[PDB]
Amino acid sequence: ENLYFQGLEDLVEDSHASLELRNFYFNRDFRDEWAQGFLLRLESGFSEGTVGFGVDAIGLLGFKLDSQDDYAKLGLTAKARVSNSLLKVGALHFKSPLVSANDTRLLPELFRGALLDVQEIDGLTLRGAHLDRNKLNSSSDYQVFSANRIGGRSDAFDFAGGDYRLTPALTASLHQGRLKDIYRQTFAGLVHTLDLGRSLKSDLRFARASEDGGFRELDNRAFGALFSLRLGAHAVAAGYQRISGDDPYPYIAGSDPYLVNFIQIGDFGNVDERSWQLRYDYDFGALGLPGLSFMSRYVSGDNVARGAANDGKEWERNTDLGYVVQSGPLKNLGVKWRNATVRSNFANDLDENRLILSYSLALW
């Protein structure tokens, strides 16, 4: 009676829910898809007690329009909290150096598994996960994993990692993971944030991977550095990335790699690839146009392995223009245009346009 009945009420009492509408148009021109999506998110409260329990749900629905994102899926996530720690089991969507779920299409990628987040020690976040399925952004069904470019088949991704604030400005990270029967990978990172009150973020990354289990021998290293300068409404970033070893940068296929020069289309993670990035952002708020945004970036890669040579080269430009309605009936309605051009001597030259209309409504 009592505590159990009350627990079920408390799950609802402290719950919240939202509905997102997305209209997505995509075109690729080599030197076409329109779809509508709905995303219903429910997050329960927790039952009272030292250990609190809850449940989240995500409802996804997509269909193609005339002018594979044609599915419906409901995913549940059981959760438990104690002190400042949280366990989620079921449908997962999160970002971390060794595994990050994608959401740059119509409907999000989901993983099936368990994710633990422990924040009991001052300045220290410890995370770990066991994942056993990948639901690609464009499909309804959970499937087993493979690695980007490298292939393979795996039914387990495991990682643990810590992000530690050594000082208020400096955070050190170490994450270690395994895509079972394909690869092992470890990531170290150091991120320094200098606020001049005007700011400079310095983001250094290094990851090494080797084979796991009976998989063929694998050797990859990836160094990245990204320096992000904010100057009022302006932002400028400069990035450098170096891939080395016999193999390209491994990550779960369908998901996002934690590479500083991973942009709209390319990851710049090819064998031996050296690349640099320049990025500019302007926030129109100060000018008096608060919903408006502009970003443009350019990444140039060389040294890419082409057989026994290293004369592979590619570049990619991206430009994002966006507006979010600030007031009136259509407040929160957003439109984003993402335009990309890729030119390469080892892959397909491509131009891509995305147009995304989005609207989110808080239900309660």
- 176: Cβ contacts below 8 Å, ≥ 6 apart: 98, 159, 160, 161, 184, 185, 186, 187
For the chain, the straight-line distance linking the first and the last C-alpha, in angstroms and rounded, comes to: 27
Q: What is the CA radius of gyration of the chain?
A: 22
Q: What is the DSSP string of 271-328?
A: TT-EEEEEEEEEETTTTT-TTEEEEEEEEEEEEEEETTEEEEEEEEEEEEEEEE--SS
Pairing of strands 71-82, 51-65: antiparallel
| Residue 217 DSSP label | P
- 23: Cβ contacts below 8 Å, ≥ 6 apart: 34, 35, 36, 37, 356, 357, 358
Give the type of residue at 60.
L
What stretches of the chain show up as alpha helix (H) in DSSP? 2-13
Q: What is the resolution of this structure in A?
A: 1.5
CA angle 173/177/182 to nearest 5° reads 145
Q: Do 287 and 277 contact (CB within 8 A), yes or no?
A: no
The closest alpha carbon to 179, from 99, 115, 95, 87, belongs to 99
For residues 60 and 73, give the distance between their C-alpha atoms in angstroms, rounded to a whole number. Answer: 5
CB 320: neighbour CB atoms within 10 A? 17
Q: Do 285 and 269 contact (CB within 8 A), yes or no?
A: no
For residues 131 and 114, give the distance between their C-alpha atoms in angstroms, rounded to a whole number. Answer: 6
The closest alpha carbon to 350, from 305, 303, 318, 302, belongs to 318
Query: Tokens representing 253?
Result: 């296929």
Domains of the chain in sequence order: 14-364 (2.40.160.10)
For residues 107 and 109, give the distance between their C-alpha atoms in angstroms, rounded to a whole number. Answer: 7
For residues 255 and 102, give the distance between their C-alpha atoms in angstroms, rounded to a whole number. Answer: 5
Give the type of residue at 100.
S
State whether residue 219 is helix, strand or coil.
Answer: strand
For residues 328 and 331, give the distance between their C-alpha atoms in angstroms, rounded to a whole number. Answer: 6
Query: Tokens representing 329?
Result: 């009936």
238 beta partners: 227, 278
Q: Do 323 and 293 contact (CB within 8 A), yes or no?
A: yes
For residues 221 and 175, give the distance between their C-alpha atoms in angstroms, rounded to a whole number. Answer: 15
Query: Tokens representing 71?
Result: 């599915």
For residues 238 and 33, give the distance between their C-alpha atoms in angstroms, rounded to a whole number. Answer: 33
For residues 341 and 349, give the distance between their C-alpha atoms in angstroms, rounded to a whole number. Answer: 8
For 347, list phi and psi in degrees, rounded to 5.
Answer: -155, 180
Can you tell me which residue has the tokens 């491994």?
250
CA angle 143/149/151 to nearest 5° reads 45
Residue 260 CA to chain centroid, in angstroms? 12
Method: X-ray
Taking every pair of Cα atoms in the chain, the longest distance, rounded to a whole number of angstroms, is 73
Give the type of residue at 289.
L
Q: Do 109 and 101 contact (CB within 8 A), yes or no?
A: yes
The closest alpha carbon to 224, from 247, 249, 246, belongs to 249
Residue 40's alpha-carbon distances to 62, 117, 353, in angstroms, are 12, 24, 27
Can you tell me which residue has the tokens 């393979």?
152
